[model samples]
Target chain A: SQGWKYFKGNFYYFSLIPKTWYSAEQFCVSRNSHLTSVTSESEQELLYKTAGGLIYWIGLTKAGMEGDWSWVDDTPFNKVQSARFWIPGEPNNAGNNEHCGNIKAPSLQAWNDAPCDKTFLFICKRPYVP
Target chain B: SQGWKYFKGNFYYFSLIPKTWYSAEQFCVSRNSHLTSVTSESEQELLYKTAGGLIYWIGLTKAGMEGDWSWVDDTPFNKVQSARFWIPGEPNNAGNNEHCGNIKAPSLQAWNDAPCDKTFLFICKRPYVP
Candidate 1:
């Protein structure tokens, strides 16, 4: 508990080495965290500001279903908060391969479709006081 | 530049999305930093502490020559400093495919032979006062 600090009185910030979508989630679960469930605007902004470089694997995926983009944590996507990032015409599912989401840097603006095989840093957030 | 704060009066910390060795180097150069030339023990320690999760691509590689590991910045490897973290019997060049260096965590020490295809977080440090 002393090793990690939490945010929003409930969430903690943790990072992970790059791994595939499945492996990453599995790693988080094994460590008592999730792939990261971003729910607030401030949380998203903080992520954009503090977490840098490689695009991080987030809790979004459309594995079994094609057009339904949902968080791995099962939270409903907030269109207003989500609107701030999606690159123009993005999430188009071009090639129908864009399922997972990752944060793009420099601009610190939005998410991009990254190949699942490509490794990347990931954030795992768990309830802090729990 | 107020945009970035440098480490040790000469280096700056920057992050980039996961990319291959070649692309990673090119990205750093484009942003005015090398792939990452770590020369001191403290530097390596700091990196292992602050940067977490995914293994980051470092500046050590033996691209042209098979076994001569050199920094992208042309720094000499101080065996004493390098000895702190190498996993036992590692750097064996096993499979003869380990050419690049990346920081592996949880242990927060040494590097590993990560497949180039896997995406990962990377640090880009540049001369601060320059």
Candidate 2:
């Protein structure tokens, strides 16, 4: 209820804490949701605000920042174009090991590539079930 | 069974043809093995010979040109030393999307990164369970 959002009978939440990419994904999985795939500009903005301007992991990596990127959860990304969402020069895959994605980076609206091992807050989204 | 091998009761095989990374992996999975992880130079040479020096897929990649590489199948690589196996400039992940590995490169005796979707024959290795 605290960080959760509702619209037209849908629900999602910005996490209360932080976790590594895998841990965060598993966390959302445990909740019957997933790392939110930010598909809409407004959705990204709201979720980032919920994060209180903190970086948060989202579901959009196939592993090494390449391969087939897809949302494997009960969330909806609305399929917003990537170029508009990812940070400028972000996803540069710094350190070559950067293979995960997160939002609300330093620029505050764009996303960034981060090592999956690094811990960070995250957002979760899922459709109504009950 | 015609193409199979057995030494010290351990079983392996070199396919007679080629397929994409996923297809080759699936083919091996269907046989309870996996793209052979050549832990020993001798084994590598043997498989390459069976292929007549043709390229073949192996189990190593985290998706993008980087990430946690591991074997996920009945076959076992026994955690072989990666540096001793991969080619000099390989795992270089040329073109960024190069996120998979194969052996019997054009030079023979070296491993190279490939665009997983590229088709190639592969080797399979598994333990005897029955």
Candidate 3:
């Protein structure tokens, strides 16, 4: 919690190093955290403003099954949670290869899909323990 | 054509004034151009860099059908074109309200889904004709 951003009891660390979505997840996992899982809009706004740049890796993915998305933690992936944040026309599963999730910085907060192998800056999240 | 960015053979204009997806389209249409469409990565990158902020309205939408997701100009929407630029894990149709599309700023080259009523800056595009 020392170096991470504290938002509503969640600890998030911004990593600017370009890493594939998987590497970003692994990087966060190595630190006892995983890629940021945005469960709410305020959390997303916090991540956007707390971030240094535009794009970042998040934990949502559909790699478990094509068109069947689940979070890194295997939280049930549903449209309701995504409806509030995903950028329009996203998760198009372009080339049938994209399965990972990421966030865009600033306002109009939304999630976009990317391939697991493409490299980009990502954020890692952990619950801020009381 | 005066304030637009000419790339390859197309012209784009970045409007920072916030507007709903529909208003954004009207804004573009007022100038004889429609909202930006990332037909290619270069077009997306050019718009991202040429524009000042993150989250810009584009021409893609799904208003006609719940998931038909055609462009404002009625171009047939499909996975092939989406496979090129959608942000990963996107078009989840969160809230079943997101019927519009947008592009993320900077690199990572991706698109996100947004609602038609939500307001944000937008990019307008037109063919650059000699």
Candidate 4:
């Protein structure tokens, strides 16, 4: 757990190196976690605060542009509740390629959808053991 | 929709009527909502404050005594994040029969597991329609 930090009963690994959303998820799986999912205000704060204004891929995605979104880790998606986290007029799937979720700012309204193949840093999350 | 109150893009009905958890959900379905799910702190506050010292069934429940909990409305259940809402030492499944969730106190830590068959006032929630 050298590079993993424990917060609120979960362990998180923040990778400084950038990768595609898929590759980032692969790296997290290799470490026994999925890309991190923001489920509450505290969890969201933990992510953006630690990210320090850096963009990081999250666990959210959709099958196609305009497709229904879901978490990569199978966390329940409450569209209305989750909608508030997004920057205004976002997930616009601008240019019809933005299907992956990312936190682009150091605030609650940090989420934005980007092309899945684009490279970005990521944070992995898993339950703390012991 | 006279009985319904709008909050943050959702409509909520604070049914003063008492019903079992199942019946309460049924009523919500009849109105095109599921039993209210506490997805954010604002939603939680709206519920407990409106409940006003009265116990009200919420959307969280488990299949049976000691079963894994889920939201009746299919809201994503984030175990670690949602854990904070429960009153300390609760969902105890006391007498091996507490399988439903209710907001028994008017606070952030108001959730408690109780027998689903018991009647209590309930809240119904649905997205506000334009």
Candidate 5:
């Protein structure tokens, strides 16, 4: 709660501690939020810039090894609209093991698919309370 | 062309000949439609019943071996809504190779995942002209 920052209508907390994708979501849920869902160009910009050259977990994942990508918080998804935000040629599910999404670079096109179990810093998001 | 039947605002053609999923889709495209997408219970009933105790290819397929299932013709997809239609314990991507969907039973719960290259009878669907 100490480091949470406001963006648009939501508050985001970028964790310093690293955790696997599932664990990260668990941590967020415990704190009354969920992993972040980037819905706009500015939100993505804020996320990657805050990541500051270190990969951090977001809310994107597939149901199983071969499942379609979806947000952990049920954010509406349009694959074609979101494709450009991913690191080019990424989400390749490279080596058939990458099923989690993270910001691996410092730009809008920073998203990459990585193994869900790999440890990484993560962002948690919750709506701004009145 | 000869066996095309009208059903609920669309015309469906069940191929007598067998072909791989790709080849079957090609044939459907040649006839001005893609493979059939069952969007309703009655539509699926018509599909399975018409298959007549044999498996038949549909418009469902994944982009690759480890890709999520999607319709060949861009029909709306809702994995949860469609789950009940697959045969129990199916779409399992068995042996890590099954990536195409077929009607494997003669009832509503008839869908199954199979190898895309496996030859099978197929159904094509096009909108009714009038």
Candidate 6:
């Protein structure tokens, strides 16, 4: 745990180019990976810093409710142990219809509402138990 | 007008594998494609029906606030002439953490929350006017 480890044993960053959220997810899967999902503050911070001014996709969403957030791994929320970088009212459920999350750079403050079709770089993590 | 069209056109649907919901909006803008933001109901219904038992992502998110839903394309919402299909209590702001949305099929009810890392087939629509 000294350094960041990917979900499948390796970490690969991909450029989304231009695709819908669904398409992006599928593309990641097709590559044997899914959209990025950061499990710790260190990971988030690292990603934010490395991303610079570019935006990337992460595995986060509130598909069914207003505040029920979770990761692609089906992990429960643990604010105490979770990454803290979102800007105030960032995921405020604007338009009463915001789900899915991504990371921005430069300020690296928090997540924002980005168009799935806009295209941006993304991170993919694969577990490595070896 | 026999087929689907939106974005700068007119369509809306939302779904996702999962998320990490940044502590703020710092995350979405930090990531690419921003987040999901569907633009139509017929688009929504079409998505659900087409989804067929499986789950998929959509351009829909309620980040920054509630009931402030808008398409990722930055287009305004058009529920009147939009596609139709979504189980009641949906987009219900459940858990108050739901930002992204997904389409589940077979019953073709509406959107649902899925893990982003979970692999699934997705659809991407590009304009083609000949």
lDDT of 2 at B42: 70
TM-score of each: 0.45, 0.47, 0.47, 0.49, 0.50, 0.44
Q: Kindly list the per-residue Cα lDDT of model 3 for residues A1-130, writing each as its tens digit.
A: 3578778877888885787665465467656787877667677778777664478888887632124666775556666766768777876878865767788646544677886667788888887777
In what order do the candidates fall by TM-score, top score first? Answer: 5, 4, 2, 3, 1, 6
**Worst-scoring 10-residue span by lDDT in model 1 chain B:** B61-70
Model 6 has an lDDT value of 0.50
TM-score for candidate 3 (chain B): 0.84
- Model 2: per-residue Cα lDDT over B37-102, one tens digit each: 656667666656666667778776452122545554523434346566666766686776565678
lDDT of 1 by residue, B13-121 (tens): 5454676554455456556667676677677777777665557877766532224556765577665767656656667665654556777763535777554444566
Per-residue error for A14 in candidate 2, Å, reads 1.8
lDDT of 5 by residue, B1-130 (tens): 4788988899999889997775576567668788898888999988988888998999987642225677877797767888878898888978776768899998789999887667899999999876
- In model 2, which runs have C-alpha deviations exceeding 4 angstroms? A1-3, A63-68, A74-80, A106-109, B1-130
Name the runs in model 3 displaced over 4 angstroms.
B1-130
Task: List candidate 6 segments past 4 Å from native.
Answer: A1-10, A115-118, B1-130
Give the TM-score comparing model 6 with the true structure, all chains together.
Answer: 0.44
For residue B89, give model 5's deviation from the true position in Å: 35
Task: Report the Cα lDDT for residue A26, model 1.
Answer: 49
Runs of candidate 4 with Cα error greater than 4 angstroms are A64-66, B1-130
Worst 10 residues of 4 chain B by lDDT: B60-69
Candidate 6 chain B: worst 10 consecutive residues by lDDT? Answer: B20-29
Q: How many backbone clashes does candidate 1 have?
A: 15
DockQ computed for model 5 against the true two-chain complex using alpha carbons? 0.02
TM-score of model 3 vs. true structure: 0.47
TM-score, candidate 4, chain B alone: 0.93
TM-score of chain A of each: 0.80, 0.80, 0.87, 0.94, 0.95, 0.73
